[PDB]
Design a protein around this nucleic acid. Sequence first.
DNA 1: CGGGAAAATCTCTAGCA
DNA 2: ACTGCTAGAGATTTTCCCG
DNA 3: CGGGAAAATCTCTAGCA
DNA 4: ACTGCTAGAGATTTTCCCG
Lengths: 47, 47, 65, 65, 249, 224, 249, 224
Amino acid sequence: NFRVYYRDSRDPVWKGPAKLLWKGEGAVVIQDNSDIKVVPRRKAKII
Amino acid sequence: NFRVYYRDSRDPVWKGPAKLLWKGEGAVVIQDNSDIKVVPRRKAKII
Amino acid sequence: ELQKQITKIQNFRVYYRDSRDPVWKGPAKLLWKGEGAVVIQDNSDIKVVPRRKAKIIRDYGKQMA
Amino acid sequence: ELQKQITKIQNFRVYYRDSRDPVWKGPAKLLWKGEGAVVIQDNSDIKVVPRRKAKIIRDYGKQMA
Amino acid sequence: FLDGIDKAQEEHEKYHSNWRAMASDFNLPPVVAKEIVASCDKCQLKGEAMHGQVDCSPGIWQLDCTHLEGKVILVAVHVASGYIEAEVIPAETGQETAYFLLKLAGRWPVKTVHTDNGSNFTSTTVKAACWWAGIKQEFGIPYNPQSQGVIESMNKELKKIIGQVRDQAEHLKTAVQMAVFIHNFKRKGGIGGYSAGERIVDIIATDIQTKELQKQITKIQNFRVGPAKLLWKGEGAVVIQIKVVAKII
Amino acid sequence: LDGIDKAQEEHEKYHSNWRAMASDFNLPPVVAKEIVASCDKCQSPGIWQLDCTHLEGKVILVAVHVASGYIEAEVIPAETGQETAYFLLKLAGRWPVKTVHTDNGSNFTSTTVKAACWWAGIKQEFGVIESMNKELKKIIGQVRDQAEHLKTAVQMAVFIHNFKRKGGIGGYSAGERIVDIIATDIQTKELQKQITKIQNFRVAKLLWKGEGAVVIQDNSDIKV
Amino acid sequence: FLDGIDKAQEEHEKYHSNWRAMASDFNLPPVVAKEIVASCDKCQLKGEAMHGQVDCSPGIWQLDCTHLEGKVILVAVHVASGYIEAEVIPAETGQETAYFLLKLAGRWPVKTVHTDNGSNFTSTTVKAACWWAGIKQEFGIPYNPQSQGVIESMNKELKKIIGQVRDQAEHLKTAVQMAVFIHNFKRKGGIGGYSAGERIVDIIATDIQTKELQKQITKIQNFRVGPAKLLWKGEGAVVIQIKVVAKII
Amino acid sequence: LDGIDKAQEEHEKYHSNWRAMASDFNLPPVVAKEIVASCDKCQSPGIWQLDCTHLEGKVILVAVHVASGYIEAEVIPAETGQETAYFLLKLAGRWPVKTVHTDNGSNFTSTTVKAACWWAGIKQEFGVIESMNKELKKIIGQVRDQAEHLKTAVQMAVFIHNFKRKGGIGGYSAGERIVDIIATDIQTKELQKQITKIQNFRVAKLLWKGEGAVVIQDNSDIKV
DNA sequence: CGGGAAAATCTCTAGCA
DNA sequence: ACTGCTAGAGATTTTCCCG
DNA sequence: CGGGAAAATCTCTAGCA
DNA sequence: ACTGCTAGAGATTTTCCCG
Ligand SMILES: O=C(NCc1c(F)cc(F)cc1F)c1cn2c(c(O)c1=O)C(=O)N1[C@H]3CC[C@H](C3)O[C@@H]1C2
Ligand SMILES: O=C(NCc1c(F)cc(F)cc1F)c1cn2c(c(O)c1=O)C(=O)N1[C@H]3CC[C@H](C3)O[C@@H]1C2
Ligand SMILES: [Mg+2]
Ligand SMILES: [Mg+2]
Ligand SMILES: [Mg+2]
Ligand SMILES: [Mg+2]
Ligand SMILES: [Zn+2]
Ligand SMILES: [Zn+2]
Ligand SMILES: [Zn+2]
Ligand SMILES: [Zn+2]
């Protein structure tokens, strides 16, 4: 189980935590509040 | 004797050539068309 | 036969990259080319590089040797 | 006398930088402090660093040794 | 020191001090202070300091609309070679992007196009053109242009070359085609000392030749090395179906 | 090395081209090229053909790579010199065009097309284009129903001709054929560069300088 | 091959091809092709790939106005330590910058202020305040914020900390002062594992102590090592007035 | 090392503080601190004082560092609790403020100042401030002519008091004095951290672990 | 083998907007 | 389940060429 | 000396707008 | 005649601690 704090779209604020659904090299797929998002690993921190 | 081609102020076009009056680390002082300018070495090429 | 063809496919050069190194590694020797992977020999090291990470060329500067 | 004062001024640490290396070098030993230059000893190398390129501190983590 | 942990918790709830400040001030081991910081949602404000790597297969292209002199230039690049195709389009509509993309797919073997989430590329018109020509549509992360780092970079270079030939042409489309010519055939350097045109020809000819060579090789070699398949037998290694491992049959 | 005089004998009896003697005997291409160039018995890829076809009242510029059949068509709004020069500049930027053959039309001899050819470095010289206009018109008539405008139908026909119609000797498409032809052209140009680079050196014509063993042509006898 | 040089000149006048393309196409040595490129004014479009290094003397500060929530925050940083002083000012006028700067110079030993070419800092009011307090005014290259890379960076961090404490305060000035407190005393790490406040205290106390120590040392040591001055005598080196050279007197 | 028992004897006869025995005998500060703490004969920097002065009808918050005399003044528009809390938060962010002494005014006992002190971690406790208000008023009266507003004159007076008026024992200014005092405070805090870090270890109290030689206090006798 | 010179590789940056 | 890159300007390491 | 664990250093990135 | 930097997140090299 992981927590993901991400930066979504032109929005300087960071959101989270979100469940990590998939981790590839370069980007991750997470699930935040029943919405699935795909965020680059530069704009996401995983705990 | 040197030639300097520089980028002046928020202007994407490059100007030159200009006489190199002084070369320090980080910036240079040049003379272009009877006007003395000080340009960082990132925005100047010296021949 | 097939040994000539294996030498032919080894005559090809591959410029690959690792998963977290942003610079293109040198011209390894192509041993095998698959649909998703590519077996290379670089500095006597046999690597399996993903297909999306390799540029395979026959450098036409091979007209020298 | 003056040897104690020279040891005192050598007790200070200097974090300097070279003209084209953007990373701060380690804590060299301050041998001499001038108005425009600073003589340091880093890895048994005596350097003359410009004053604008050095942060001289007495690291108060010296309360350990 | 677990009372120091409580004090550090109650003080991080106020100042949001980093792990080193809490380790120094409350005599906490670095692990405990780092965990106190990692449990605060307000302190997770920095991402991983790395970069991805775009797909550079020989069949993937990257497309992007740039703007110059109040006109729209639709540009495409071959990610594996840097071969560019640019056109000044009358509008940024998807009906023009579909035409440009169908033309490109007719000229070169386009297997995949990677674009941003511009309306031009996201439309049903470009979606039908790709389905007809057999192209796969890949879209980058929304508002993450680094996913298209190749084509965006080429944008720069394209514009650069245009600035060097803008006075040789009377119209912008002529200058754009001049820039495409100069980039593809008058600028050498890269993974082979090639130009972009020589490099795309090498890439595609090599893809075809190696595909046929391997299809002829696997058709002859029948050796099981569990009962895997022999991919390549070497003097000090044996590749199987893919690891670099033997009881070759 | 040990295959030089052998390949000389094969070319004495079989007269294989230098590309065969090179890869079959591990010879550097310069050595095999001098072998084939030392014989008495043995002593295109940039030619395009342009035309204008009229279909559905529209004008279509068609450019054929005579060496491979690779076609390239564009529905232009008018049969004027400006659009012909634009098409030619596009093509020359896309492919290595060296010579264009035209039917002496009013839009091919205009000054604008001449300037475009001069800039791109194309030689303008005034049978294949007719047959491939016929084939392109047939493909357009086949796939006209799947398009609302004629330009997209023309592009679909170009796609089908360049990558879906396979034939010829080995069953390749026009795209594979043109990419192979341009690849051999690049090899020829690189070999000519390598040959010109070492014709200035005198050792006894130099042919190749390997690890420490130079290849020489002395008294027209290759001597390593 | 000097006719190849003429052909390459005449073709670079058209395509502006780089040195490698002209060296490959016309059999030119790299020097000749590079000189053909270097003689074209249109091809000089890239600067040196380096970076300068800001002045980090113990007496230099860097000032900058940032904006947050429609309000102006005048920030100053001690370049040698990272100690920040920020104030929400009612306007970006130079009459307020002079007040902020005179206050700062009264609080700390400010010897030099390095600012951008904002009207606030370029005014006659800030020029009179600096002349009174004895400060030296340094301005960066116009439209080159990297010259102020320290303070600009701090801007970011300041804003960052504000975003972590914006809900603890009812006004923006209170949150700015909270952020200054947190940065100067609740964030450790750097050249000493210090906070910015501990680091500025160390920097300034060290400057004073070393100045007095050296003033007492040179007053005693009188040794000529031409007849230079002995700065430091070592076991394997001797420093003179400054090289690292002996006939010490 | 060889100076431990020697420094014990000096402290037996001279009773020097640990800062002297440390640098004069090359002892780690923990060892000298245990030496001074093992004797029977031997067994402030964060205190500020705030007040409000009235001048030219304006209200000026004056904060004095009691340990060094370093003054810090600010002309505030009103003598209310909000501006006092703002001044206190500014000061606490600028300097390491640990305790504030006030004259029990209406603007120092307000809930806002209490909340500011609670946030910044300041202890509010309710002679030096009077003398330095007098001195600051004298400097303001001296330099009032060079200013158009009273706030800039107050800042000029603060500058002159903190960096131009030198006196005391060694002829230092208030700024040098406060920076030296805060430096010794930082040294004290770091030494207390180092002492607390090694009081958990039992070897026989541990005092210092150098290269391979530990310093021990066994039976209240320091034994390396 | 000893350097000098030249080619090859490494390092780093701006613009893409 | 996806992803910075590219070409140029200096600097520095490697290679080659003659003795 | 042989590892394991932990601390220290190195590498790299975004925002500063 | 002036000049990118800073702090955090992982990765990797160094050091220390017990046998
Ligand atoms: O920031 C851009 N370039 C500069 C840049 C870069 F190239 C690469 C980097 F690593 C960083 C950079 F700063 C850039 C932004 N956008 C679009 C671009 O094509 C584009 O290049 C675009 O088309 N859209 C549409 C899709 C949704 C709407 C319309 O918003 C986006 C915004
Ligand atoms: O681009 C800015 N920051 C972002 C940034 C950075 F911080 C550091 C980088 F290496 C790169 C960056 F992109 C930035 C721009 N300007 C001013 C700033 O303070 C400022 O930070 C400013 O005050 N002026 C005035 C002086 C003349 C007028 C008014 O135009 C300038 C514009
Ligand atoms: Mg776009
Ligand atoms: Mg773009
Ligand atoms: Mg500014
Ligand atoms: Mg700024
Ligand atoms: Zn927190
Ligand atoms: Zn023959
Ligand atoms: Zn040019
Ligand atoms: Zn005592």
